[PDB]
Amino acid sequence: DSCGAEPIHIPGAIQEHGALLVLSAREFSVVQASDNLANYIGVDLPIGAVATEANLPFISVLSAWYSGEESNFRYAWAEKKLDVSAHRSGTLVILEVEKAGVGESAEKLMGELTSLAKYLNSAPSLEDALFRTAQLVSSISGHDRTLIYDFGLDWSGHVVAEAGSGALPSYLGLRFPAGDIPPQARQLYTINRLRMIPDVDYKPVPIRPEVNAETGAVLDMSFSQLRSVSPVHLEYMRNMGTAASMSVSIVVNGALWGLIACHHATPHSVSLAVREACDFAAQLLSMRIAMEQSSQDASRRVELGHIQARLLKGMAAAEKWVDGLLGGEGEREDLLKQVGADGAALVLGDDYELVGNTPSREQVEELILWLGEREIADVFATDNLAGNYPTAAAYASVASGIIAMRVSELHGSWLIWFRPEVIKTVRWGGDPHPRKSFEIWKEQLRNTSFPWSEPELAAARELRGAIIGIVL
Amino acid sequence: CGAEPIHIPGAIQEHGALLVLSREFSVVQASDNLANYIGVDLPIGAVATEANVLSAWYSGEESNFRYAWAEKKLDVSAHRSGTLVILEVEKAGVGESAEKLMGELTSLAKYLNSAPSLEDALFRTAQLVSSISGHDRTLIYDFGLDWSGHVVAEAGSGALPSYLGLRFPAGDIPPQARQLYTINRLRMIPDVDYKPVPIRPEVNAETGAVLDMSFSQLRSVSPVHLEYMRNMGTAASMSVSIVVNGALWGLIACHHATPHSVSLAVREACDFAAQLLSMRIAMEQSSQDASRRVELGHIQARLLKGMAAAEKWVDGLLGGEGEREDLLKQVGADGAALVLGDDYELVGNTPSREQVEELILWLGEREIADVFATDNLAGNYPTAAAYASVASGIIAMRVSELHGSWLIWFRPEVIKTVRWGGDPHIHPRKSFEIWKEQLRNTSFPWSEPELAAARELRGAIIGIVL
Ligand SMILES: CCC1=C(C)C2=CC3=N/C(=C\c4[nH]c(/C=C5\NC(=O)C(C)=C5CC)c(C)c4CCC(=O)O)C(CCC(=O)O)=C3CCN2C1=O
Ligand SMILES: CCC1=C(C)C2=CC3=N/C(=C\c4[nH]c(/C=C5\NC(=O)C(C)=C5CC)c(C)c4CCC(=O)O)C(CCC(=O)O)=C3CCN2C1=O
């Protein structure tokens, strides 16, 4: 992968819309600065120069912030009509200024986020919540489009919500490949959960010197708001037909879950106040995504537990243990519901017992012959068995998904769950330098079952213990 | 005590005015002081005109209303009360910035979401509310089952005493108060010695009944509580209900040595804080409870595996060292007794056979459709104070349809010093000086994943007996 290579956190440049000034913590002496710094601060505060009241009036407050626990800094510099925002970078203090947006009212913004927060807290459907948020951010940002983007496992992403003036195309329901947000980007966005690109064709403003005197290494601009972005992405943006962007990371249990991602046909900047409202929205949404994702997963483990109980009760109470699973109509229905499967095969040497919708004995024999040649210390699972075992495309209709599970130490006894092919049309807007066309690219997904939930596998892992234990 | 209806006192505090409109927008009821604030005659019967947004709010879904009346320097805040519109005005707190408040709640929300210890979260919140309210003390108060409360966090100028760690009796916030505060999650008393401002008429024309002031911010409070406040040495208060999944979990409770009022804007920032904290309390309370069901599941698995594999089913529980250890860990118990008629099997730390026999004789007289449980068996069965040291907590459980077979879990007395700040054992009490006691005959409380693990195992046993 050439994509993942580029180090995006140390480009030694900023965008034009602000200025960057590096101080050494000791005596607050200017080590590095953007070339444009002179234009904004409006002073000769150059390399080597030590910061005093007459340079930075907020120096006392900055000093007192550095000594304190607080991680970031904000000061509204009335006299120059600027907003100052500083983070710490080891022994360094990175300090970013940009022109203080007029016209915003915080009493409106507060009223609007009081509403979202109160609504999200009134447990609504995950989809309803997703949109409401996308809608609020579209309102206060004023972006042509405000889509929400939920990552899957493969780190491809599905546009799950959208909100737009209709100036830019509808991407709602389209999936994009993982390569569009590469691993380093993902990593950064998990710790720095907001980036704004107000003009795509901005000319990078260099930071001099390139190498910091005090550290003797490139300035890590991971948490720099003004950080100049990957030229390759500025191209991706052009291809798409966006002149402006602003993403906001949705993070649930320290995992990048998705992005709130605004776009604009023409260049478009957004106030500090409004960016700080969108971060708050992204947090509130992230708290909901977790509570939904949680209480949903919670109810599932309970529902699968009640089953595992009935299967273990039956396996203990009955004369032959096997009849706890296959004994009656209810038992054989539990065995299947225990992982939400359509079919099950309980092999015990040369003693096959098929339940529900399975492939034939001869097909399962040949399946077990191939599971024998894998490394399965836990349980084998897949929602595309065809992709692993090409010969099992012949019975895709009935088994595209299996949870295979050996139920001894000595091989030749198994419990496999089967799950049928679910065809679904996938609309990419793209395909498998960046790509020029995002025209809705279709495909039917074959030989692929409904995906195995983690409470389902965990219910299976358990039952295996129980069976393996009764066999001994 | 629970009797007195605190939602229909037909009076307001002095710090605002209340005006009831019927939609012809006609004045039905008003506080006596209304004239002083609005500065207009707008009397009983009178229909509202410009000289005398709200219209568009009434037609809309939105439940509450806010308009900052710049010209008179007032905040207007209206709720709906059936066919009525209750409308409350008070003097707009000056100087305040919403850009600050937003910045402060952006921080808290981002911090709470950065999964910190429940205690850390509790304090940070109490600290933020202490900052924007400017109250002498800003304690957080977590209800138990008995509806007594434990002060779990605090933040103060040090003007008023530290109640951190002290428990208060349920009688301090009586059932009707609790009920109201679960639906109206905010109340402010800016001056304890306020003179109640009457609402006239006492009987509303449109409804023909006393004005339900459940959601009235200005509602005059129980004289008995104004006394409790005096006894405590507080002139001012402001509570904010912490509600988690529709259940009143606790209160953010600010106090002041001298009278002290707080803007609508700042009260609405503290409600937001209480919500953000409530979302954390749920996520912690959830992912904790989640890990517990998994840990107890892995056990229930081993117990059911053993009970199926072994020759006699009973040996799945008491067979070996590991099995006997699982049986106990299945509810985090120190002891277990598996009775099967006249066939006792004691595990870990239990009371004697003769003591359990006599225990089972009393559980027979109780009626247990689920499982019997308690962390104060002494309080239910006085004679089992004799073996409190070993069984202050039991999960008793009948393990057949045919009587005479049981599975009881034992849990030992945990002595703990309880600091009350008041004798909790009607007029209110004058002294809130740290009142100590050793709490006896009481085990560590039974978690809900523990009982649920027990409920399960019973099914399994009762099923193998058939
Ligand atoms: C339709 C849904 C959607 C997608 C798929 C999407 C993509 C997206 N890519 C972004 C970032 C990057 N893409 C790339 C690189 C690539 N993207 C590609 O598609 C390809 C081929 C590359 C080459 C490695 C890089 C390095 C970055 C990090 C830029 C930086 O901060 O320095 C970013 C972050 C840019 C932003 O919005 O500020 C996005 C967000 C915007 N966005 C969307 O709304
Ligand atoms: C140390 C922790 C703590 C406690 C224990 C506490 C008590 C408290 N009592 C409150 C309310 C009431 N108590 C009572 C009644 C009693 N309080 C008592 O102590 C006693 C004996 C009674 C009657 C039996 C009533 C009716 C009310 C409802 C007042 C209203 O909503 O108008 C209220 C809510 C009233 C408020 O504070 O604004 C509180 C909150 C303040 N507060 C605390 O911070």
XYZ file of N, CA, C and O in Angstrom, chain B residues 295-356:
248
model
N -19.165 -12.884 33.169
C -18.338 -13.558 34.207
C -19.173 -14.641 34.907
O -18.615 -15.721 35.187
N -20.458 -14.365 35.166
C -21.419 -15.287 35.836
C -21.927 -16.340 34.850
O -22.325 -17.434 35.303
N -21.957 -16.005 33.562
C -22.349 -16.923 32.477
C -21.350 -18.050 32.338
O -21.797 -19.214 32.340
N -20.055 -17.712 32.239
C -18.915 -18.663 32.112
C -18.988 -19.707 33.231
O -18.659 -20.879 32.955
N -19.400 -19.283 34.430
C -19.606 -20.153 35.627
C -20.807 -21.075 35.385
O -20.622 -22.307 35.408
N -21.988 -20.490 35.170
C -23.266 -21.215 34.906
C -23.039 -22.296 33.839
O -23.616 -23.389 33.967
N -22.222 -21.993 32.827
C -21.761 -22.944 31.788
C -21.103 -24.142 32.465
O -21.592 -25.259 32.245
N -20.054 -23.901 33.266
C -19.233 -24.951 33.932
C -20.122 -25.794 34.852
O -19.944 -27.017 34.874
N -21.047 -25.163 35.569
C -21.990 -25.852 36.493
C -22.949 -26.747 35.698
O -23.243 -27.863 36.161
N -23.435 -26.270 34.553
C -24.402 -27.020 33.711
C -23.672 -28.135 32.954
O -24.241 -29.221 32.829
N -22.447 -27.881 32.489
C -21.544 -28.881 31.845
C -21.316 -30.041 32.816
O -21.505 -31.196 32.404
N -20.926 -29.730 34.056
C -20.638 -30.707 35.125
C -21.872 -31.515 35.509
O -21.786 -32.721 35.694
N -23.015 -30.831 35.630
C -24.263 -31.451 36.048
C -24.767 -32.430 34.989
O -25.514 -33.345 35.310
N -24.382 -32.208 33.728
C -24.775 -33.070 32.625
C -23.816 -34.266 32.509
O -24.306 -35.397 32.303
N -22.506 -34.025 32.643
C -21.421 -35.001 32.375
C -21.332 -36.060 33.488
O -21.035 -37.222 33.159
N -21.547 -35.675 34.751
C -21.318 -36.525 35.950
C -22.459 -37.536 36.105
O -23.546 -37.282 35.545
N -22.210 -38.622 36.854
C -23.133 -39.777 37.046
C -24.354 -39.330 37.863
O -25.484 -39.511 37.372
N -24.143 -38.768 39.058
C -25.199 -38.093 39.865
C -25.119 -36.591 39.569
O -24.007 -36.028 39.698
N -26.241 -35.973 39.174
C -26.311 -34.553 38.730
C -25.755 -33.635 39.823
O -25.042 -32.683 39.481
N -26.037 -33.950 41.090
C -25.701 -33.114 42.280
C -24.191 -32.842 42.328
O -23.804 -31.748 42.782
N -23.373 -33.784 41.848
C -21.886 -33.724 41.886
C -21.349 -32.697 40.882
O -20.145 -32.412 40.941
N -22.190 -32.179 39.986
C -21.840 -31.045 39.110
C -21.631 -29.760 39.901
O -20.954 -28.844 39.374
N -22.211 -29.692 41.109
C -22.177 -28.512 42.011
C -21.167 -28.739 43.146
O -20.351 -27.813 43.387
N -21.213 -29.903 43.810
C -20.417 -30.151 45.053
C -19.333 -31.219 44.822
O -18.612 -31.550 45.791
N -19.201 -31.717 43.594
C -18.306 -32.844 43.249
C -16.878 -32.629 43.717
O -16.431 -33.395 44.591
N -16.190 -31.629 43.149
C -14.759 -31.360 43.397
C -14.526 -30.000 44.031
O -15.515 -29.357 44.403
N -13.255 -29.598 44.131
C -12.794 -28.315 44.735
C -13.248 -27.148 43.849
O -13.745 -26.141 44.411
N -13.067 -27.292 42.529
C -13.441 -26.297 41.503
C -14.948 -26.125 41.405
O -15.390 -24.967 41.315
N -15.705 -27.231 41.429
C -17.193 -27.243 41.327
C -17.791 -26.499 42.523
O -18.634 -25.608 42.311
N -17.367 -26.872 43.732
C -17.816 -26.265 45.014
C -17.477 -24.770 45.020
O -18.238 -24.002 45.615
N -16.377 -24.379 44.367
C -15.905 -22.968 44.251
C -16.781 -22.218 43.235
O -17.061 -21.028 43.454
N -17.191 -22.881 42.152
C -18.095 -22.294 41.131
C -19.463 -22.062 41.773
O -19.921 -20.922 41.739
N -20.068 -23.090 42.373
C -21.383 -22.984 43.068
C -21.426 -21.692 43.892
O -22.445 -21.005 43.835
N -20.351 -21.367 44.610
C -20.269 -20.158 45.479
C -20.124 -18.891 44.625
O -20.835 -17.912 44.912
N -19.228 -18.896 43.629
C -18.901 -17.710 42.785
C -20.096 -17.345 41.882
O -20.127 -16.196 41.394
N -21.048 -18.270 41.687
C -22.220 -18.144 40.773
C -23.138 -16.995 41.217
O -23.911 -16.508 40.363
N -23.083 -16.593 42.492
C -23.795 -15.390 43.020
C -22.835 -14.555 43.879
O -23.322 -13.669 44.593
N -21.528 -14.803 43.782
C -20.505 -14.210 44.660
C -20.851 -14.405 46.127
O -20.870 -13.406 46.868
N -21.138 -15.644 46.527
C -21.512 -16.038 47.906
C -20.282 -16.583 48.632
O -19.372 -17.045 47.949
N -20.271 -16.539 49.963
C -19.200 -17.146 50.796
C -19.587 -18.578 51.180
O -18.673 -19.349 51.531
N -20.873 -18.922 51.113
C -21.374 -20.253 51.504
C -22.604 -20.651 50.715
O -23.279 -19.752 50.176
N -22.884 -21.953 50.653
C -24.065 -22.546 49.983
C -24.521 -23.780 50.761
O -23.652 -24.479 51.311
N -25.835 -24.002 50.834
C -26.465 -25.224 51.381
C -27.389 -25.796 50.309
O -28.345 -25.101 49.950
N -27.092 -26.995 49.812
C -27.926 -27.716 48.823
C -28.684 -28.830 49.550
O -28.142 -29.936 49.662
N -29.891 -28.529 50.031
C -30.789 -29.485 50.745
C -31.600 -30.276 49.709
O -32.099 -29.659 48.740
N -31.732 -31.589 49.916
C -32.547 -32.502 49.071
C -33.325 -33.457 49.983
O -32.932 -34.629 50.087
N -34.386 -32.956 50.623
C -35.140 -33.680 51.666
C -34.394 -33.660 52.991
O -34.294 -32.560 53.587
N -33.861 -34.816 53.414
C -33.029 -34.969 54.638
C -31.562 -35.181 54.247
O -30.845 -35.882 55.004
N -31.137 -34.595 53.123
C -29.806 -34.839 52.504
C -29.099 -33.493 52.316
O -29.094 -32.975 51.173
N -28.540 -32.949 53.406
C -27.882 -31.618 53.453
C -26.455 -31.739 52.919
O -25.802 -32.768 53.147
N -26.011 -30.705 52.209
C -24.625 -30.554 51.707
C -24.228 -29.085 51.858
O -24.651 -28.288 51.020
N -23.478 -28.751 52.911
C -23.025 -27.368 53.211
C -21.698 -27.131 52.490
O -20.891 -28.072 52.449
N -21.506 -25.937 51.920
C -20.289 -25.536 51.156
C -19.779 -24.205 51.710
O -20.618 -23.371 52.062
N -18.457 -24.024 51.777
C -17.804 -22.787 52.252
C -18.155 -22.466 53.696
O -18.016 -23.364 54.558
N -18.591 -21.227 53.952
C -19.005 -20.726 55.289
C -20.536 -20.657 55.357
O -21.104 -19.704 54.786
N -21.168 -21.610 56.054
C -22.640 -21.697 56.265
C -22.966 -21.647 57.750
O -22.093 -21.881 58.584
N -24.235 -21.384 58.135
C -24.699 -21.709 59.484
C -24.824 -23.238 59.601
O -24.760 -23.903 58.581
N -24.989 -23.764 60.814
C -25.045 -25.225 61.091
C -26.274 -25.842 60.419
O -27.211 -25.090 60.115
N -26.260 -27.160 60.205
C -27.410 -27.936 59.666
C -28.662 -27.537 60.451
O -29.632 -27.103 59.816
N -28.612 -27.636 61.783
C -29.741 -27.336 62.707
C -30.243 -25.906 62.472
O -31.446 -25.692 62.593
N -29.346 -24.967 62.166
C -29.681 -23.542 61.887
C -30.355 -23.408 60.507
O -31.263 -22.560 60.391
N -29.932 -24.203 59.510
C -30.456 -24.180 58.106
C -31.824 -24.876 58.076
O -32.746 -24.324 57.442
